[PDB]
Amino acid sequence: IPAAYTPGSTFYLPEFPYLLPARRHPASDRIRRSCETWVRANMRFAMADQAEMDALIEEGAALWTCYVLPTADEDRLLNLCRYTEYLSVFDNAMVDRTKIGKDPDAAKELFHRVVNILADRAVGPDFEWGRVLGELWRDMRVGFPEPVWDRFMAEVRRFLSGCVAEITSRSDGMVFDYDTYLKVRRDSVGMGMYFVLGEYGLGIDLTEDLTRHGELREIVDIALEHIMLTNDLFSFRAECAMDDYVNALAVLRLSEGLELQDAVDRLFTVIEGRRTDFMAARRRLESGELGGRADVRAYLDALWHMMAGNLQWSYLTSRYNGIGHVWNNVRSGIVTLHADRTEFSDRPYWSLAR
């Protein structure tokens, strides 16, 4: 794998229009405080030391959830934040993408343990993973209609399948082409789970509407690709400094031969295309049979906030931008990709000098 970038590389990051500043849940600060308390109390078993726990909380996974579901009910959103942190703690403590790409026995052992936990059969060393998940899903299931809950469970299993298929072809050696990256990443990104959790957040149930109208399924799918591609743009530096190349920008560099700026321009254009496709789909849906439905209107608005909040959080998080990152509020300008951090400068596109 030739490098997708070299430390100190630069490119101009443009600001996607419309999306920012993203709407945030009005009770975010209050929600995140309770979430943090819960994480430090219940997920301590999974972290080596205090410093690792602090570093993980500092990435702000619960803040992602508050930006992505800003019209959710506050008490429901607290449950979802704790679920988001649980999944991040699980990834950090249990998943060594490097070890399990090079070692099929280690991959197999992880998969067996995840099956046990997901199926609520966790004993011995993994007992706490299944206890915590059980109580969390117990809390979440209150006021969570069964047709929506079943779709959420299908999304969790789809997330597992996607993560497996991505490891399957990462220990296969090849860096994907775009079309193959799309089929894998659409499932491994896990955003499918949050489209359904967003119905729960709103207190609505669109099961029958999703069955009846493919235009409604299509708009969800447009938002899915928007979010996964936007995520890849901002996670590129960190993920390609770990040699994980299931990343759209890596794919455009290494498989389609674009220079870094041209690959960023191309990925920007694709994501903008999903944003314009989304707005066009939304106009048709809000003028058709479902346009009189306040619950459907609320959900289409919520889909927008998931796209916008996902972009907003990508600037904020140390997970992508480096240990100790504090965002300087610069949304566009020349970015410098260092080995340990993303530097956002406001230097303009005309000054690239290349």
C-alpha positions as CSV (number, residue, x, y, z in Angstrom):
1,I,0.0,0.0,0.0
2,P,1.7,3.2,-1.2
3,A,0.9,6.0,1.2
4,A,-2.4,7.9,0.7
5,Y,-0.5,10.9,2.2
6,T,2.9,12.0,3.6
7,P,3.2,13.9,6.9
8,G,3.1,17.6,6.2
9,S,1.0,17.2,3.1
10,T,-1.4,20.1,2.6
11,F,-4.7,20.6,0.7
12,Y,-7.5,23.2,0.7
13,L,-10.6,22.1,2.6
14,P,-13.7,23.8,1.3
15,E,-16.8,24.4,3.5
16,F,-19.8,22.5,2.4
17,P,-22.7,25.0,2.0
18,Y,-26.0,25.1,4.0
19,L,-25.0,22.6,6.7
20,L,-23.2,24.8,9.2
21,P,-23.6,25.9,11.9
22,A,-25.4,22.6,12.6
23,R,-28.4,22.5,15.0
24,R,-27.5,21.0,18.4
25,H,-29.8,19.6,21.1
26,P,-30.7,22.5,23.5
27,A,-30.0,20.3,26.5
28,S,-26.6,19.0,25.2
29,D,-24.5,20.2,28.1
30,R,-26.8,18.7,30.7
31,I,-27.1,15.4,28.7
32,R,-23.4,15.1,28.2
33,R,-22.7,15.6,31.9
34,S,-25.0,12.7,32.8
35,C,-23.6,10.6,30.0
36,E,-20.0,11.2,31.2
37,T,-20.9,10.2,34.7
38,W,-22.5,7.0,33.4
39,V,-19.5,6.2,31.3
40,R,-17.0,6.6,34.1
41,A,-19.2,4.5,36.4
42,N,-20.1,1.6,34.0
43,M,-17.3,1.4,31.4
44,R,-14.3,1.6,33.7
45,F,-13.9,-2.2,33.6
46,A,-13.0,-1.8,29.9
47,M,-10.2,0.9,30.2
48,A,-6.6,0.3,31.2
49,D,-6.1,3.5,33.2
50,Q,-7.6,6.8,34.1
51,A,-5.7,8.5,31.3
52,E,-7.2,6.3,28.6
53,M,-10.7,6.8,30.0
54,D,-10.2,10.6,29.9
55,A,-8.8,10.6,26.4
56,L,-11.8,8.6,25.1
57,I,-14.4,10.9,26.8
58,E,-12.4,13.8,25.3
59,E,-13.2,12.6,21.8
60,G,-16.9,13.6,22.4
61,A,-18.8,10.6,21.0
62,A,-21.9,11.8,23.0
63,L,-21.5,15.2,21.4
64,W,-21.8,13.5,18.0
65,T,-25.1,12.1,19.1
66,C,-26.4,15.5,20.3
67,Y,-25.4,17.1,17.0
68,V,-26.9,14.2,14.9
69,L,-30.2,13.9,16.8
70,P,-30.8,17.5,18.0
71,T,-34.7,17.2,17.8
72,A,-34.8,14.0,19.9
73,D,-36.5,13.8,23.3
74,E,-33.9,14.7,25.9
75,D,-34.3,11.6,28.1
76,R,-34.3,9.3,25.1
77,L,-31.2,11.1,23.7
78,L,-29.3,10.5,27.0
79,N,-29.9,6.8,26.4
80,L,-28.6,7.1,22.9
81,C,-25.5,9.0,24.0
82,R,-24.7,6.2,26.5
83,Y,-25.1,3.7,23.7
84,T,-22.8,5.7,21.4
85,E,-20.1,5.8,24.1
86,Y,-20.6,2.1,24.8
87,L,-19.8,1.3,21.1
88,S,-16.8,3.6,21.1
89,V,-15.4,2.0,24.3
90,F,-16.0,-1.4,22.8
91,D,-14.1,-0.4,19.6
92,N,-11.2,0.9,21.6
93,A,-10.9,-1.9,24.1
94,M,-11.9,-4.9,22.0
95,V,-11.1,-4.2,18.4
96,D,-7.4,-4.1,17.2
97,R,-7.8,-3.6,13.5
98,T,-4.1,-4.2,13.0
99,K,-3.9,-7.4,14.9
100,I,-7.0,-8.9,13.3
101,G,-6.1,-8.0,9.8
102,K,-2.8,-9.9,10.1
103,D,-4.0,-12.8,12.3
104,P,-7.1,-14.8,11.3
105,D,-7.2,-16.6,14.7
106,A,-7.4,-13.2,16.5
107,A,-10.1,-12.1,14.1
108,K,-12.0,-15.3,14.7
109,E,-11.7,-15.0,18.5
110,L,-13.1,-11.4,18.4
111,F,-16.0,-12.5,16.2
112,H,-17.0,-15.4,18.6
113,R,-16.9,-13.0,21.6
114,V,-19.1,-10.4,19.8
115,V,-21.7,-13.1,18.9
116,N,-21.8,-14.1,22.6
117,I,-22.3,-10.5,23.8
118,L,-24.8,-9.5,21.1
119,A,-26.9,-12.6,21.8
120,D,-26.8,-11.9,25.6
121,R,-24.9,-15.1,26.4
122,A,-21.8,-13.3,27.9
123,V,-20.0,-15.1,30.7
124,G,-16.6,-15.0,32.3
125,P,-14.3,-12.2,31.2
126,D,-17.0,-10.7,28.9
127,F,-19.8,-10.8,31.5
128,E,-19.8,-7.0,32.0
129,W,-20.0,-6.2,28.2
130,G,-23.3,-8.1,28.1
131,R,-24.6,-6.9,31.5
132,V,-24.1,-3.2,30.5
133,L,-25.5,-3.6,27.0
134,G,-28.5,-5.5,28.5
135,E,-29.4,-2.7,31.0
136,L,-28.8,0.0,28.4
137,W,-31.1,-1.7,25.9
138,R,-33.6,-2.3,28.7
139,D,-33.7,1.5,29.4
140,M,-33.9,2.2,25.6
141,R,-36.7,-0.2,25.0
142,V,-39.2,1.8,27.2
143,G,-41.3,3.8,24.8
144,F,-39.6,2.1,21.8
145,P,-42.3,0.5,19.6
146,E,-41.6,-3.1,18.7
147,P,-41.7,-2.6,14.9
148,V,-39.0,0.1,15.3
149,W,-37.0,-2.0,17.8
150,D,-36.9,-5.0,15.4
151,R,-35.5,-2.7,12.6
152,F,-32.9,-1.3,15.1
153,M,-31.8,-4.9,15.9
154,A,-31.5,-5.7,12.2
155,E,-29.3,-2.6,11.9
156,V,-27.0,-3.7,14.7
157,R,-26.5,-7.1,13.0
158,R,-26.0,-5.3,9.6
159,F,-23.3,-3.2,11.3
160,L,-21.6,-6.4,12.5
161,S,-21.8,-7.9,9.0
162,G,-20.3,-4.8,7.4
163,C,-17.5,-4.7,10.0
164,V,-16.7,-8.3,9.2
165,A,-16.8,-7.9,5.4
166,E,-14.4,-4.9,5.7
167,I,-11.9,-7.0,7.7
168,T,-12.5,-9.9,5.3
169,S,-11.1,-7.8,2.4
170,R,-8.5,-5.9,4.5
171,S,-6.7,-9.1,5.2
172,D,-7.3,-9.8,1.5
173,G,-4.7,-7.1,0.8
174,M,-6.3,-5.0,-1.9
175,V,-7.3,-1.4,-1.6
176,F,-10.8,-1.2,-2.9
177,D,-12.1,0.5,-6.0
178,Y,-14.9,3.0,-5.5
179,D,-17.8,0.7,-6.3
180,T,-16.6,-2.0,-3.9
181,Y,-15.8,0.5,-1.2
182,L,-19.4,1.7,-1.4
183,K,-20.9,-1.7,-0.9
184,V,-18.8,-2.4,2.2
185,R,-18.7,1.0,3.8
186,R,-22.5,1.5,3.5
187,D,-22.8,-1.4,6.1
188,S,-19.7,-0.9,8.2
189,V,-20.3,2.7,8.9
190,G,-23.2,1.9,11.3
191,M,-25.2,5.0,10.6
192,G,-28.0,2.7,9.6
193,M,-28.6,2.1,13.3
194,Y,-29.0,5.9,14.0
195,F,-31.6,6.4,11.3
196,V,-33.8,4.0,13.2
197,L,-32.8,5.4,16.6
198,G,-33.8,8.8,15.3
199,E,-37.4,7.6,14.9
200,Y,-37.3,6.5,18.5
201,G,-35.8,9.9,19.5
202,L,-38.7,11.7,17.8
203,G,-41.3,9.3,19.3
204,I,-42.5,8.2,15.8
205,D,-42.8,5.0,13.9
206,L,-42.3,5.0,10.1
207,T,-42.2,1.2,9.6
208,E,-45.2,1.1,7.3
209,D,-44.3,4.2,5.5
210,L,-40.8,2.9,4.7
211,T,-42.3,-0.4,3.5
212,R,-44.9,1.5,1.3
213,H,-42.7,4.2,-0.2
214,G,-39.3,3.5,-1.7
215,E,-38.7,7.3,-2.1
216,L,-38.6,7.4,1.7
217,R,-36.1,4.5,1.8
218,E,-34.1,6.3,-1.0
219,I,-33.8,9.6,1.0
220,V,-32.4,7.7,4.0
221,D,-29.9,6.0,1.6
222,I,-28.8,9.4,0.3
223,A,-28.2,10.6,3.8
224,L,-26.3,7.4,4.6
225,E,-23.8,8.0,1.8
226,H,-23.5,11.7,2.6
227,I,-22.6,10.9,6.2
228,M,-20.2,8.0,5.4
229,L,-18.3,9.9,2.8
230,T,-18.1,13.1,4.9
231,N,-16.8,10.9,7.7
232,D,-14.1,9.5,5.4
233,L,-13.0,13.0,4.3
234,F,-12.3,14.0,7.9
235,S,-11.1,10.6,9.3
236,F,-8.7,10.1,6.4
237,R,-5.6,11.5,8.2
238,A,-6.0,9.3,11.3
239,E,-7.2,6.1,9.6
240,C,-4.5,6.2,6.9
241,A,-1.9,6.7,9.5
242,M,-3.0,3.4,11.0
243,D,-3.0,1.6,7.5
244,D,-6.8,1.1,7.4
245,Y,-7.7,2.1,3.9
246,V,-11.5,1.4,3.7
247,N,-11.7,5.2,3.2
248,A,-13.2,7.0,0.2
249,L,-10.4,9.5,-0.1
250,A,-7.7,6.7,0.1
251,V,-9.7,4.9,-2.6
252,L,-9.8,8.0,-4.9
253,R,-6.0,8.5,-4.3
254,L,-4.7,4.9,-4.5
255,S,-7.2,3.4,-6.9
256,E,-8.1,6.2,-9.2
257,G,-4.7,8.0,-9.2
258,L,-5.9,11.5,-8.2
259,E,-3.5,13.9,-6.6
260,L,-4.4,14.9,-3.1
261,Q,-6.2,18.2,-3.9
262,D,-7.9,16.7,-6.9
263,A,-9.0,13.7,-4.8
264,V,-10.4,16.1,-2.2
265,D,-12.1,18.2,-4.9
266,R,-13.7,15.0,-6.3
267,L,-14.9,13.7,-2.9
268,F,-16.3,17.2,-2.2
269,T,-18.2,17.2,-5.4
270,V,-19.7,13.7,-4.8
271,I,-20.8,14.6,-1.3
272,E,-22.3,17.9,-2.6
273,G,-24.2,15.7,-5.1
274,R,-25.7,13.7,-2.3
275,R,-26.7,16.9,-0.5
276,T,-28.4,18.3,-3.7
277,D,-30.0,14.8,-4.3
278,F,-31.3,14.9,-0.7
279,M,-32.9,18.3,-1.0
280,A,-34.6,17.4,-4.3
281,A,-35.9,14.1,-2.8
282,R,-37.1,16.0,0.3
283,R,-39.0,18.6,-1.9
284,R,-40.8,15.7,-3.7
285,L,-41.7,14.0,-0.4
286,E,-42.9,17.1,1.3
287,S,-45.2,17.8,-1.7
288,G,-46.6,14.3,-2.1
289,E,-49.0,12.1,-0.2
290,L,-46.8,12.1,2.9
291,G,-46.5,15.9,3.0
292,G,-49.3,16.4,5.4
293,R,-47.7,14.2,8.0
294,A,-46.0,16.1,10.8
295,D,-44.1,12.9,11.8
296,V,-42.7,12.5,8.3
297,R,-41.8,16.2,8.1
298,A,-40.1,16.0,11.5
299,Y,-38.1,13.0,10.3
300,L,-37.0,14.6,7.0
301,D,-35.8,17.6,9.0
302,A,-34.0,15.1,11.4
303,L,-32.3,13.5,8.4
304,W,-30.9,16.9,7.5
305,H,-29.6,17.4,11.1
306,M,-27.8,14.0,10.9
307,M,-25.9,15.1,7.8
308,A,-25.1,18.5,9.2
309,G,-24.3,17.4,12.7
310,N,-22.0,14.7,11.5
311,L,-20.0,17.3,9.5
312,Q,-19.9,19.7,12.4
313,W,-18.6,17.1,14.8
314,S,-15.9,16.0,12.4
315,Y,-14.2,19.4,12.9
316,L,-14.5,19.2,16.7
317,T,-13.3,15.7,17.7
318,S,-9.8,14.8,18.8
319,R,-10.6,11.3,17.5
320,Y,-9.8,12.6,13.9
321,N,-7.8,15.8,14.5
322,G,-5.3,14.7,17.1
323,I,-4.8,14.3,20.9
324,G,-5.5,17.6,22.6
325,H,-7.2,19.0,19.6
326,V,-9.3,22.1,20.3
327,W,-11.1,23.4,17.2
328,N,-10.2,27.0,16.2
329,N,-13.6,27.4,14.4
330,V,-11.9,27.5,11.0
331,R,-14.3,25.7,8.5
332,S,-12.2,26.2,5.3
333,G,-8.7,26.9,4.2
334,I,-5.4,25.0,3.8
335,V,-5.2,22.0,6.0
336,T,-1.8,20.5,7.0
337,L,-1.8,16.7,7.6
338,H,0.7,16.0,10.3
339,A,1.5,12.5,11.6
340,D,-0.2,13.3,14.9
341,R,-2.7,16.0,14.1
342,T,-4.9,17.9,11.6
343,E,-4.1,21.6,11.4
344,F,-6.9,23.8,10.1
345,S,-5.6,27.2,8.8
346,D,-7.7,29.8,7.2
347,R,-5.3,30.4,4.4
348,P,-7.4,30.7,1.2
349,Y,-7.6,28.5,-1.9
350,W,-5.9,31.1,-4.1
351,S,-2.8,30.8,-1.9
352,L,-2.1,27.1,-2.5
353,A,0.7,28.1,-4.8
354,R,0.7,24.8,-6.8
